[PDB]
Design a protein around this ligand. Structure first.
Ligand code: HEC
Ligand code: HEC
Ligand code: HEC
Ligand code: HEC
Ligand code: HEC
Ligand code: HEC
Ligand code: HEC
Ligand code: HEC
Ligand code: HEC
Ligand code: HEC
Ligand code: HEC
Ligand code: HEC
Ligand code: HEC
Ligand code: HEC
Ligand SMILES: O=S([O-])[O-]
Ligand SMILES: O=S([O-])[O-]
Ligand SMILES: O=S([O-])[O-]
Ligand SMILES: O=S([O-])[O-]
Ligand SMILES: O=S([O-])[O-]
Ligand SMILES: O=S([O-])[O-]
Ligand SMILES: O=S([O-])[O-]
Ligand SMILES: [Ca+2]
Ligand SMILES: [Ca+2]
Lengths: 519, 259, 519
């Protein structure tokens, strides 16, 4: 059984914790729930840590007093089909392999499934660790509760004796690096300096051996990613997000200065040896738009190249951990501002961006966002009980499972079937334009080898490569983004029509040049 | 927001609470969750209460850290048919009126329904208070969460100016007395001496005016009826049961001395 | 009404029948249930048949005493979508037409449906008889009971006056031959010599006119294919299977000598004019793995060519009726051992194998097979009755229809939804790798005409053709095999990664050679 410690002892040295803990809704929650600091207190001085206290990062540390929220979070949605490859005719991107050739996602890119699995799925996907990690057997894929208890309770490592990234099966890649883990877990929150910069007090950084780092990590989506454990107040902890909102002064809502001021973020910094070490962003309000934007954004979390001179941009570079914080029509400018692209297309040779699930940036300026609706209203609504204490569902999933709470309370004019029909109208229309964008991109890509072999000039090929950048960006945003247009239907429409226009322009350019060589 | 108090200072006088609280699974749960003792601490000695501290008996005191248990308790089972008289051909006792004639249960004896309603149902049944108490209207019969928040949030008293047991409608009885309430609530746990015997320190006893007692009670089946709030360990609080098992030496299983 | 005959009369001449019938569970079942032998007994001698007795092969001969098993067998699973072409984007092999070009399956290859239809479906598929046979009208496609009563009760022949294989509609083929029928019916069990070799006593053989043979056949999947009618004991009757297990000494479990000895097969031969004529394989145990392996295997049942010199291998050759009895990683060696391939790819010119539903060979060495599980545990389980005599379901279908009996009795840790999710994880992952294997095969195939037209050498084209053999084998095994990886997920994964590797190797070889011609 837990025995309480005297927090006044701690507060003598930890004045920021004192100011947060004594004022918030955890003022009565004793430190012993999350820290074992007995030897620390015996050996610390006001400026030296002494013995390092143990800090619990397991979700069960919160589940004892908050069982309803924990249980709602860990539920597995079995209807969210698992390990389902997107590069198939029945999924999001039928022509993905041709369009993405040259990039590591060609090795595997599955649809998302329930949050319980995020860390294990990151470890086992074919593009990440060369197939080094597997579930202990194929039965363990069902075990959401086990994954939450810890990745290493359900996974195996093919070679515990080595720590290098290498292929263990032929059709795998080794794309994973330490930046990735910041959107899968924050078990490393006390061991990673802000942005992953080198730091004397940091065990792990952008340049660490990712296999060694992985072995130290266990829990998905820690509860404290959105809730300060000391004040219980709303926050973010993701470095890249704090960097965009606060350091670069872009604001929580870059298109709306007023909403940014009402619903802002305050950066709180913690030091080691009196040098800045790590930071959090305290939110003015419990704003799920910004909480979910810790991960559901377009980002760099990988090495790349410079647009200017084509030189390698390695993990050591700050740009390898970056939130662009830009909508699809501002993205090219944002990538130019850091002089960066992701890969060269294997067929066309074009410098190209790689887009990641940009839900937050897509949602900006949409009808729902403009009306003050937030991710949680549709994806984590309040539970409705005939007789009960209301709490917020933490099962972050499609509103199709809870249409009464997620849609119909606001849309009183609709039945469930009518609201579903409105969603499908948007998704069907947008998916049609995605498929057409892919048809035109593929037609363009396939002309590159024909043009090369016909002796078309490098100048013409480079003109087509510049068009490929835009044709790609204005398509891939929408196969990356998970709502199939629902979050912003007009923007999806405008972007996908632009993609098709760019590809058609490139097709015309190449066809004419090929024909001129033939004559 | 709650601010914790110095529990060690309490323990200078409260040695039984100290022994229970420091050892069990509520050792880290501060007294401020259930007690407002600021003036008490200022005025008490080990031999004098001073100002009486406030003690919370509402179930929400536990629901903050144990929402799953609270929500499962308060749920209303709509299939448990409400206000269903047992003395009918389709219920438990078709000839109950003839057989029970002379007893107060002849005025009304319904089948049980969900625990959330036990205190309000005790107050409104025709055999108990002469029909003095009613739900505010016939819609309120559904409101389990409201009854749990407190009986007087969902009930009305026909005559707040009098405190006597009498009939307000002809076919009612006044069978209720203070002993009844021990199986409906323990809001009176600090105001009732063991067995309801007369005691200088008891506001309420077996001989109190039950209408006055009723007005002072709010919550059904308090969570602490089965769980000690200090140790979190298993217990009972009902005097009559402790009297049978312990005082009269019958044991928890009178037919099995080993068990 | 049936009148019993004196079996002692028969036993004077039929001593093998005596030894089987008098000992087994049909010792009390009189010969008249299945034979009309009155004139036979009047005219036979100990070595000459005289008048041929009539033998019933209709399933109703068993249904009188075994109605439960019969009714469970004949049930139509309407959820098993009928006449569904696999070469479509929503089915098993979206790029099948490009990959299989040159082979008769390009004319039609539908998904399987319920066993009641196997003989009629064989007769009416577009690749088989040139469209000669049809159901009497499009309503008859529903009539499972009618198909079981007899194919010719529900089918019509476009030209009863001719017996040649020819096209009756333009986009059909005439792939059917007498070997095919051995996996659709055994009505011919007394009229076909072992392996279909020429024999004086055999009415039909590998070289027969298949249209004439077809007209003589009526019933699907006779009950006696797995149960000896005389002893009632477990057996197989399929010649190709007996040949692999017994004649070639490969064993019932080629990867496990011990299991092969515990669960073995005894070949029993019957003679005509004191010369070996036909055979059965009596099983040591009621082993559904080996019973279902009569048909659910990779096989030759067709003419082909020699790998060594490219010469035709006709129906007259023993190799036209062959069970390879080899897993995917042993198959190439098995085809080399008989010097055989199926077709030349229409685009690449590569010699290629054609793979057939290799469920039995895929199941070997899988986790379930290693734990002593058999096909019937998941596809024909015991019926569970609150009050009833237990029998074995004969409705051989997906375990999704009976998850309680097929999975959950063994997997107590799972709900039905969890077990379904585990199946889908495997099928989704494997199908993703199938689609990727097809993408790479298609990319390779499409380079052949480009290379040819650029003047690439025959030596390079032949190197690519050798790679095509392996790229094809390691892909097609999995579109042929019906579990979409479930029966052996690790093997599917290893094979499909090998396919992709081989195709990528060939793409690189051809691209480099084309580029060298251009420069
Ligand atoms: C002064 C003598 C201290 C006492 C009393 C307590 N802590 Fe401490 N702590 C102290 C220092 C100098 C440091 C290094 C960081 C800094 O602020 O200078 C720490 C660090 C921690 C940590 C972080 C550990 C990590 O892994 O990075 C924790 C969780 C922590 N301290 C907790 C803690 C508790 C619970 C205390 C009361 C029991 C406590 N500290 C007392 C200095 C001092
Ligand atoms: C019991 C000892 C608790 C532990 C362990 C955790 N929390 Fe808590 N939490 C607790 C209480 C008594 C309260 C106040 C309840 C009230 O409404 O009065 C809270 C509150 C929260 C909140 C809401 C805060 C707000 O300002 O609205 C959150 C978001 C919260 N708690 C989160 C949380 C986390 C993430 C925990 C694990 C690190 C955790 N709590 C543990 C009691 C206890
Ligand atoms: C936050 C900015 C992230 C970074 C850094 C990484 N990932 Fe991620 N990932 C993120 C989200 C919001 C999602 C779900 C939405 C979606 O579009 O899938 C994911 C999903 C995955 C998955 C599962 C789906 C799949 O692609 O198969 C995997 C396997 C995964 N992510 C791996 C991964 C790798 C290897 C990363 C570093 C190269 C990485 N993620 C970083 C958010 C973020
Ligand atoms: C990084 C730590 C994340 C935070 C914060 C949020 N999400 Fe997320 N989400 C993330 C990943 C890596 C995945 C894929 C997990 C996998 O194993 O594949 C997801 C997935 C989702 C989904 C799909 C769930 C399903 O049933 O398939 C949804 C609807 C979703 N995410 C929504 C969502 C919301 C609304 C968030 C703020 C409350 C949120 N996520 C935060 C990564 C992270
Ligand atoms: C960000 C992706 C979150 C994660 C990780 C966790 N919670 Fe959460 N929580 C989140 C939101 C948007 C809200 C609603 C805020 C509002 O006022 O609208 C909450 C709320 C809570 C509460 C408060 C009580 C309630 O409303 O239910 C608690 C106690 C709470 N959350 C606990 C909790 C636990 C235990 C978590 C890990 C399993 C957890 N939260 C993660 C957003 C996010
Ligand atoms: C948060 C500030 C709490 C308050 C308010 C209440 N309880 Fe509690 N309880 C709390 C914790 C942290 C624990 C330990 C959890 C663990 O398993 O480690 C408990 C435990 C209990 C138990 C279980 C006790 C045991 O198994 O020995 C019970 C029965 C219990 N709590 C009851 C309870 C009651 C009735 C409350 C209102 C008077 C109550 N708790 C309030 C945290 C908190
Ligand atoms: C609008 C046209 C109504 C219809 C249709 C139904 N109800 Fe009603 N009801 C309505 C009002 C305005 C009121 C009084 C509200 C108040 O708070 O003063 C009521 C009252 C009831 C009651 C209580 C009656 C009592 O004597 O105390 C009940 C039990 C009730 N309503 C139930 C009910 C049922 C079951 C209905 C469908 C048959 C129904 N109402 C329809 C308004 C309207
Ligand atoms: C000796 C005079 C016989 C008598 C008595 C019976 N049978 Fe016969 N049978 C006999 C011969 C020489 C043959 C040819 C095969 C052989 O073993 O040498 C047969 C064949 C059959 C068959 C197979 C018919 C076919 O189509 O191939 C059957 C089904 C059969 N016999 C049945 C049978 C029955 C039921 C008898 C008792 C009523 C019986 N036979 C008697 C020789 C002799
Ligand atoms: C009635 C005259 C029957 C005819 C016609 C068929 N079978 Fe039979 N069968 C019959 C009996 C009385 C029994 C024994 C029942 C018992 O359990 O004691 C059987 C048994 C079988 C078995 C089980 C054998 C075993 O060793 O376990 C099988 C597989 C079987 N029978 C198959 C079968 C076939 C395929 C039939 C048509 C050729 C057939 N039976 C006809 C009675 C009768
Ligand atoms: C046993 C070794 C077989 C041989 C010989 C033939 N077929 Fe077959 N066939 C077999 C099985 C186990 C299945 C079901 C599994 C599957 O993958 O489909 C089939 C299926 C068919 C079908 C229906 C499905 C389809 O392809 O449209 C047809 C029309 C069919 N088979 C025809 C056919 C022909 C023409 C054959 C000789 C060239 C032939 N089969 C032989 C098993 C076996
Ligand atoms: C040859 C005589 C076979 C034997 C012995 C077994 N199977 Fe079969 N199976 C065969 C064919 C030709 C077909 C396709 C029939 C058609 O008309 O398309 C099948 C089909 C199946 C299926 C699919 C059923 C569905 O609902 O779609 C299954 C699940 C199946 N077969 C399983 C199976 C089992 C487990 C067997 C041993 C008990 C078995 N089959 C034997 C051909 C033959
Ligand atoms: C009476 C008004 C009918 C309606 C309503 C439906 N059907 Fe029909 N159908 C009808 C007749 C008289 C016939 C020909 C019967 C014969 O044996 O001559 C049919 C035929 C069909 C067929 C076969 C078509 C073929 O081309 O061979 C099919 C597949 C069929 N019918 C199906 C069908 C469906 C699905 C209906 C509802 C949508 C339907 N029929 C209605 C008479 C009538
Ligand atoms: C192989 C593909 C089979 C076909 C064709 C038929 N049956 Fe079958 N049968 C098969 C198996 C795997 C089993 C279970 C054996 C075990 O002990 O596990 C059976 C069993 C029977 C029985 C025994 C009683 C029972 O378990 O139900 C009978 C009487 C039986 N089978 C009859 C029967 C009939 C009538 C068939 C044609 C419709 C038939 N079997 C075909 C495998 C196969
Ligand atoms: C007993 C007769 C079983 C039947 C029926 C089913 N399963 Fe099974 N399964 C069984 C065992 C003994 C094992 C190995 C257990 C271990 O931990 O060693 C399995 C394994 C699986 C697996 C994992 C396969 C892997 O390759 O790692 C899966 C995905 C699985 N089982 C699923 C499954 C399904 C869906 C079933 C019904 C169709 C099913 N099993 C039946 C034992 C038995
Ligand atoms: O209070 S923290 O800043 O040590
Ligand atoms: O914020 S900057 O990188 O445009
Ligand atoms: O790879 S993650 O960013 O989807
Ligand atoms: O500790 S109590 O008994 O005052
Ligand atoms: O008994 S059989 O061999 O004629
Ligand atoms: O059995 S042989 O053909 O390898
Ligand atoms: O053609 S049969 O072998 O599927
Ligand atoms: Ca990116
Ligand atoms: Ca073959």
């Amino acid at each position: 059984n837990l025995k309480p410690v005297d927090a006044m002892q701690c507060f003598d040295c930890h004045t920021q914790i004192e100011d947060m803990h004594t004022v918030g809704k955890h003022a009565t929650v004793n430190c012993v729930h999350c820290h074992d600091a007995t030897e620390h207190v015996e050996t610390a001085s006001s400026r030296r840590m002494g013995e390092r206290p143990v800090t619990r990062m397991d979700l069960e540390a919160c589940a004892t007093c908050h069982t309803a929220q924990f249980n709602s979070f860990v539920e597995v949605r079995h209807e969210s089909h698992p390990r389902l490859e997107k590069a198939t005719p029945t999924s999001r991107s039928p022509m993905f392999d041709k369009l993405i050739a040259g990039h590591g996602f060609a090795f595997e890119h599955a649809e998302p499934r329930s949050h319980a699995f995020m860390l294990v799925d990151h470890f086992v996907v074919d593009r990440a660790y060369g197939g080094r990690f597997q579930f202990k057997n194929w039965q363990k894929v069902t075990d959401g509760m086990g994954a939450v208890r810890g990745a290493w309770t359900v996974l195996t490592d093919a070679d515990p004796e080595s720590s290098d990234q290498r292929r263990f099966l032929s059709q795998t890649a080794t794309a994973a690096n330490p930046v990735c883990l910041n959107c899968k877990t924050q078990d490393h929150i006390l061991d990673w300096a802000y942005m992953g910069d080198e730091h004397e007090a940091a065990k792990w950084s952008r340049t660490s051996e990712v296999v060694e780092f992985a072995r130290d990590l266990n829990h998905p989506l820690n509860c404290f990613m959105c809730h300060d454990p000391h004040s219980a107040g709303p926050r973010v902890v993701r470095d890249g997000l704090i960097n965009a909102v606060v350091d670069r002064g872009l604001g929580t809502y870059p298109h709306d200065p007023v909403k940014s001021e009402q619903q802002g973020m305050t950066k709180v910094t913690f030091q080691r040896g009196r040098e800045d070490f790590r930071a959090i962003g305290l939110l003015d309000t419990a704003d799920s738009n910004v909480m979910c934007a810790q991960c559901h954004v377009e980002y760099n979390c990988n090495p790349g190249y410079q647009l200017s001179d084509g030189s390698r941009v390695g993990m050591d570079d700050r740009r390898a951990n970056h939130f662009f914080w830009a909508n699809v029509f501002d993205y090219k400018e944002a990538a130019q501002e850091i002089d960066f692209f992701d890969f060269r297309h294997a067929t066309t040779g074009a410098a190209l961006p790689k887009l990641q699930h940009p839900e937050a940036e897509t949602f900006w300026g949409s009808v729902h966002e403009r009306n003050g609706v937030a991710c949680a209203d549709c994806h984590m609504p309040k539970v409705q009980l005939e007789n009960g204490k209301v709490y917020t569902s933490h099962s972050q999933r499609t509103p199709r499972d809870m249409m009464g709470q997620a849609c119909l309370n606001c849309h009183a004019e609709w039945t469930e079937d009518q609201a579903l029909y409105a969603i499908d109208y948007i998704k069907n229309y947008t998916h049609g334009k995605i498929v057409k964008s892919e048809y035109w991109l593929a037609k363009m890509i396939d002309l590159f080898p024909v043009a090369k072999r016909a002796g078309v000039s490098e100048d013409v090929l480079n003109q087509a490569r510049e068009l490929h950048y835009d044709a790609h960006l204005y398509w891939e945003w929408w196969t990356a983004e998970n709502s199939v247009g629902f979050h912003n239907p007009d923007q999806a429409r405008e972007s996908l029509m632009t993609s098709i226009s760019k590809s058609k322009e490139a097709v015309s350019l190449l066809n004419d040049a090929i024909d001129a060589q033939v004559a």
